[PDB]
């Protein structure tokens, strides 16, 4: 189950605040439209970005990993 082909990380971060909410997700229409809608609901003070791997993006440390799209939405709204 842990092997779903190549995955990315959807990241949510407030601009002037350190740390992020991160979720391992599969790139495609379902993730793209989720991110587009969440960016509108959260506003332009929060950045929704897609990265390949957290060890390559030290500027988002510390990472708060979540396990579902719903958990990512609730935690990103608390930033």
């Amino acid at each position: 189950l842990y092997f779903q082909g190549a995955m990315c990380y959807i990241i949510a971060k407030r601009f002037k605040k350190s740390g992020c909410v991160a979720l391992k997700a599969k790139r495609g229409k379902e993730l793209a439209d989720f991110a587009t809608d969440l960016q509108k609901k959260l506003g332009y003070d929060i950045q929704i970005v897609a990265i390949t791997r957290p060890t390559a993006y030290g500027e988002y440390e510390p990472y708060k990993f979540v396990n579902s799209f719903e958990e990512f939405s609730i935690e990103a709204s608390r930033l």
Binding site: G5, A35, A56, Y57
Partner: protein, 203 residues
């Protein structure tokens, strides 16, 4: 050629990852020639397109898709005199960490690639070190960035984002932080924060 083979890129791949603008305005123009709400609506579509391409996760290099929030801030900041292709040049941005920079400059020979060498600092030294390369299909396609950093520069770049950037300090303090790092005085992000707290107290 060589550095592209090492990172699994070629001109054909970069061409297929290029997004064609529907604004009908040359990207050689300044931001005053563009409507903010039309630009931001297009950036939302480019961001959506890059969040759906699986091919990005299979490439042998790291990448980040920048947010619509960051594009909105960049428009407000550089409006109206900055050139469009200089502002929105990193929506798709690759990042490759290495041992040296000698291989990177050779990319200048590519007709559609521009090299911004900041390995000896930006004009206004803020501490950051690296080489940024931009591929652009034509003036109607968004540029694609590749950021090259040695392991040595990427370490300080990281600490500088974490403990220094976007906190109201002058760019003068980053150059000083880079001088302390080059001198063996900063070996942790907490040590960076310590010499920043002393620089700000004694400034």
């Amino acid at each position: 050629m060589y550095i592209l083979d090492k990172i699994g890129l070629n001109i054909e791949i970069l061409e297929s990852l290029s997004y064609e603008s529907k604004l009908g305005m040359s990207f050689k123009r300044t931001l005053s020639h563009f409507n903010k709400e039309e630009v931001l609506k297009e950036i939302e579509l480019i961001n959506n397109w890059y969040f759906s391409l699986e091919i990005i996760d299979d490439l042998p290099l790291d990448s980040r898709i920048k947010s619509v929030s960051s594009a909105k801030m960049k428009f407000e900041r550089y409006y109206p005199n900055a050139t469009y292709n200089r502002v929105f040049n990193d929506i798709l941005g690759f990042r490759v960490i290495c041992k040296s920079y000698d291989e990177v400059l050779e990319l200048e020979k590519e007709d559609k690639i521009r090299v911004v060498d900041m390995s000896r600092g930006k004009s206004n030294d803020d501490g950051f070190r690296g080489i940024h390369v931009y591929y652009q299909r034509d003036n109607h396609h968004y540029p694609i960035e590749i950021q090259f950093n040695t392991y040595y520069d990427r370490q300080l770049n990281d600490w500088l984002h974490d403990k220094f950037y976007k906190r109201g300090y002058d760019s003068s303090c980053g150059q000083l932080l880079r001088k302390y790092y080059e001198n063996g005085k900063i070996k942790s992000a907490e040590e960076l924060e310590e010499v920043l707290e002393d620089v700000l107290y004694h400034c």
